[PDB]
């Protein structure tokens, strides 16, 4: 029973103590559901935290660290109980243990603590976790351990309210520059996921990522053999090209567009949807970037997805087309018309998602407005495919911005 175990772990007899802490560890590491609340309420936490000081019994330290690791894996209240019992400074101590498995378990427990949220992360950071953590990254570290280190790095990078301090980001980026050349898939996946978390934090963090020099190593992972790697990288570069035109061009200069035919035609619709969302952010760029997308022969693939894709992919392709009309030359828009964009574009006028409808009406209006003299020909094509009837029906929509734009388009 729990009473016996709690009483026994604070013992003078080294074998009963080890046995009792081992029993507690095993209680937390077996079934799909462990008794975490009963162990928290039993009072065992101070015994386990005390066990972390026992440099004379690395087996006891490992077992106690593992128990605490698994307690910290539960809800925020359970993780905070581990934190409130003063475990964090003791785990930071065990990062300098000569015993590898003890060190790895200390890393793992700290990973679970860091993962709970931004304030917990920032506490662990303020106590100095990052340098001893990144010091493990070396050619000789065993791979199971290196993987656990990289998972902790992901948890240092992923919370955004606030993001990790700039100085912490500055320490992690050189390590990611090292790890992105690893051949192990799980390490590569985590490294790239970390980059995707840094690149979603804002334009200054995007710039730091660019300045590390890693983007030319990141872009080619879009064609990696493992799909988990491809989609992590697709997220990371997609976030970079949400930045300025200058920032977007860094990604394009890495030949990013050469990787997209295999993403636009991928069997998995989620990959199609991500890739079209990337391209919509390229076509929102300057005229030279628009031309880069045209010249990569991606517009026909986009229009096909506009016509026959899943609704999420259709919505992003609608944005990519409309954004193309906003910041595009007359001749680039003419290329769109020649590729028969108009019918599949107008077919989205009837969907129940008003945001997509607004985007489409805006793009149709801009298309007609930019072709100063050819406006009659373009109006006739819109009529031919039923677009006029669709606009007339959109005059009765609930949404004022929609019905206003439909009236304005028909009048103008």
């Amino acid at each position: 029973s729990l009473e016996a175990i709690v009483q026994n772990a604070s013992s003078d007899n080294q074998g009963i103590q080890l046995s009792a802490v081992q029993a507690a560890r095993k209680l937390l590491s077996s079934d799909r559901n462990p008794p975490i609340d009963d162990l928290i309420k039993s009072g065992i936490l101070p015994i386990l935290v005390h066990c972390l000081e026992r440099d004379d019994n690395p087996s006891l330290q490992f077992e106690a660290a593992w128990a605490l690791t698994n307690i910290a894996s539960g809800t925020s209240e359970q993780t905070q109980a581990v934190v409130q019992s003063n475990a964090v400074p003791l785990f930071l101590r065990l990062l300098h243990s000569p015993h590898q498995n003890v060190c790895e378990q200390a890393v793992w427990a700290l990973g679970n603590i860091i993962g709970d949220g931004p304030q917990c992360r920032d506490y662990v950071i303020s106590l100095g976790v990052v340098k001893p953590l990144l010091s493990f990254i070396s050619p000789s570290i065993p791979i199971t351990f290196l993987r656990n280190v990289t998972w902790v790095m992901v948890n240092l990078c992923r919370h955004k309210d606030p993001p990790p301090p700039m100085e912490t980001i500055q320490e992690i980026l050189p390590a990611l520059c090292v790890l992105i050349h690893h051949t192990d898939v799980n390490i590569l996946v985590d490294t790239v996921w970390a980059l995707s978390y840094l690149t979603d934090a804002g334009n200054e963090q995007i710039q730091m990522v660019i300045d590390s020099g890693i983007v030319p190593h990141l872009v080619p992972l879009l064609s990696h053999q493992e799909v988990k790697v491809q989609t992590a990288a697709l997220r990371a570069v997609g976030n970079i090209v949400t930045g300025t035109d200058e920032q977007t061009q860094v990604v394009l200069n890495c030949d990013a567009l050469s990787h997209f035919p295999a993403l636009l035609t991928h069997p998995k619709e989620k990959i199609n949807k991500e890739a079209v969302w990337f391209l919509s952010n390229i076509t929102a760029g300057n005229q030279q970037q628009v031309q880069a997308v045209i010249d990569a022969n991606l517009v026909p693939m986009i229009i096909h997805l506009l016509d026959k894709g899943d609704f999420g992919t259709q919505k992003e392709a609608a944005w990519a087309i409309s954004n193309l009309t906003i910041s595009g030359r007359k001749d680039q828009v003419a290329y769109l018309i020649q590729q028969n964009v108009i019918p599949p574009f107008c077919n989205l006028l009837t969907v129940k998602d008003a945001q997509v409808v607004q985007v489409v009406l805006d793009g149709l209006s801009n298309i007609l407005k930019m072709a100063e003299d050819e406006a009659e020909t373009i109006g006739n094509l819109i009529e031919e495919c039923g677009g006029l009837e669709k606009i007339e029906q959109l005059q009765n929509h609930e949404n004022e911005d929609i019905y206003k734009l439909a009236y304005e388009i028909i009048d103008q």
């Binding site: 698994n70 993962g115 709970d116 998972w151 992901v154 996921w193 979603d200 949400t242 944005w319 954004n323």
Partner: peptide, 21 residues
Amino acid sequence: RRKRKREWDDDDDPPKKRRRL
């Protein structure tokens, strides 16, 4: 003209907490 940030789930994220077995 402007860029957008994604409006979907991204349910493939790596685990925040991991319980060792």
